[PDB]
Design an enzyme around this catalytic site. Sequence first.
Site, PDB file in Angstrom:
ATOM      1  N   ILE A  71       3.252  -4.298   0.974  1.00  0.00           N
ATOM      2  CA  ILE A  71       3.438  -4.434  -0.511  1.00  0.00           C
ATOM      3  C   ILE A  71       3.124  -5.877  -0.930  1.00  0.00           C
ATOM      4  O   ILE A  71       3.720  -6.758  -0.431  1.00  0.00           O
ATOM      5  CB  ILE A  71       4.876  -3.978  -0.949  1.00  0.00           C
ATOM      6  CG1 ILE A  71       5.006  -2.457  -0.790  1.00  0.00           C
ATOM      7  CG2 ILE A  71       5.244  -4.449  -2.386  1.00  0.00           C
ATOM      8  CD1 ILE A  71       6.463  -1.992  -0.810  1.00  0.00           C
ATOM      9  N   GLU A 160       7.474   2.156   4.929  1.00  0.00           N
ATOM     10  CA  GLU A 160       7.972   2.499   6.276  1.00  0.00           C
ATOM     11  C   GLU A 160       8.022   4.044   6.455  1.00  0.00           C
ATOM     12  O   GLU A 160       7.685   4.578   7.532  1.00  0.00           O
ATOM     13  CB  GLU A 160       9.330   1.832   6.597  1.00  0.00           C
ATOM     14  CG  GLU A 160       9.233   0.298   6.507  1.00  0.00           C
ATOM     15  CD  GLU A 160       8.485  -0.312   7.675  1.00  0.00           C
ATOM     16  OE1 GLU A 160       7.577   0.387   8.183  1.00  0.00           O
ATOM     17  OE2 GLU A 160       8.865  -1.439   8.144  1.00  0.00           O
ATOM     18  N   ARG A 163       4.487   5.248   6.982  1.00  0.00           N
ATOM     19  CA  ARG A 163       4.162   4.998   8.393  1.00  0.00           C
ATOM     20  C   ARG A 163       4.767   5.957   9.445  1.00  0.00           C
ATOM     21  O   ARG A 163       4.117   6.247  10.489  1.00  0.00           O
ATOM     22  CB  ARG A 163       4.454   3.556   8.815  1.00  0.00           C
ATOM     23  CG  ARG A 163       3.690   2.487   8.060  1.00  0.00           C
ATOM     24  CD  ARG A 163       4.268   1.088   8.403  1.00  0.00           C
ATOM     25  NE  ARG A 163       3.486   0.013   7.760  1.00  0.00           N
ATOM     26  CZ  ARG A 163       4.028  -0.993   7.072  1.00  0.00           C
ATOM     27  NH1 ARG A 163       5.354  -1.055   6.982  1.00  0.00           N
ATOM     28  NH2 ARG A 163       3.256  -1.926   6.504  1.00  0.00           N
TER      29      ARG A 163
HETATM   30  N1  LIG Z   1       5.954  -6.390   2.180  1.00  0.00           N
HETATM   31  C1  LIG Z   1       5.958  -5.406   3.123  1.00  0.00           C
HETATM   32  N2  LIG Z   1       5.278  -4.267   2.867  1.00  0.00           N
HETATM   33  C2  LIG Z   1       5.249  -3.251   3.768  1.00  0.00           C
HETATM   34  N3  LIG Z   1       5.870  -3.280   4.988  1.00  0.00           N
HETATM   35  C3  LIG Z   1       6.548  -4.427   5.234  1.00  0.00           C
HETATM   36  N4  LIG Z   1       7.296  -4.768   6.352  1.00  0.00           N
HETATM   37  C4  LIG Z   1       7.805  -6.014   6.152  1.00  0.00           C
HETATM   38  N5  LIG Z   1       7.437  -6.467   4.964  1.00  0.00           N
HETATM   39  C5  LIG Z   1       6.645  -5.506   4.380  1.00  0.00           C
END
Ligand SMILES: Nc1ncnc2[nH]cnc12
Length: 246
Positions: A71, A160, A163
């Site tokens: 992000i 997450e 993913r």
């Molecule tokens: N900004 C972010 N976007 C996506 N996954 C992440 N994991 C840690 N920071 C993140």
Amino acid sequence: DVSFRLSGADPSSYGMFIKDLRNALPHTEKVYNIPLLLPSVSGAGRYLLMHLFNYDGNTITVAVDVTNVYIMGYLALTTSYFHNEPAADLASQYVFRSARRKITLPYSGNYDRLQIAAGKPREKIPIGLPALDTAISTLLHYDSTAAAGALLVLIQTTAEAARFKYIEQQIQERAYRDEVPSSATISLENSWSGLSKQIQLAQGNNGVFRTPTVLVDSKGNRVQITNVTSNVVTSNIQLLLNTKNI
Ligand SMILES: Nc1ncnc2[nH]cnc12
Ligand SMILES: *[C@@H]1O[C@H](CO)[C@@H](O[C@@H]2O[C@H](CO)[C@@H](O)[C@H](O)[C@H]2NC(C)=O)[C@H](O)[C@H]1NC(C)=O
């Protein structure tokens, strides 16, 4: 673009958003039948816009980098916000250019800085659909300390979960009651890069990992992932960080 409304949301409309988010990320190849994210993407096409809508119907647009699900920033009303790091600064050149003002947050976007800024490790921050509705709401008005916690919620719910199917299911179970993440959720979050690389390395190594990845399981204890026959590989991970970015 993709979109998600918290108003009326249930495990199935969230599943449908997380599907769309995965399907928005381009790939030309699948490795062991897992979309392989691109080395790089030039220009604005690098950035996916997620429109999130709180329970009341207020909205933020989140900018996501399609090569790593990272992000970079978001737009609330007429203000854009971006993490304090080179990759978000780059994104600011392409997205939300029509914001009346741009604020750069006083931290980068990695979990370690965000936790510092939030005062809390994310082991202690409830997540779920209700935590996500709060987060949208928090990010509508600038408050840097409270934004850090909301961004933790936002990242885990959206990136997450795209993913890992397991993290998606965790959120679904937290559709109407927030709950801090399981240790396996934390484990999976922290191994994405490692898994993405070992899965790519297994491709010239008969499905075998060059280096085993240590996780924590559902049950609540430590396990070693050594090859592509693992449940982690065959049903859990949904996206691979290209080794060209590791
Ligand atoms: N900004 C972010 N976007 C996506 N996954 C992440 N994991 C840690 N920071 C993140
Ligand atoms: C790939 O992973 C499997 C586990 O998923 C490994 O096999 C297991 O390990 C030993 C036997 O060698 C036993 O403790 C387990 O019960 C086995 N389970 C199953 C389902 O077979 C296997 O050794 C790994 N292969 C490589 C090349 O690393």
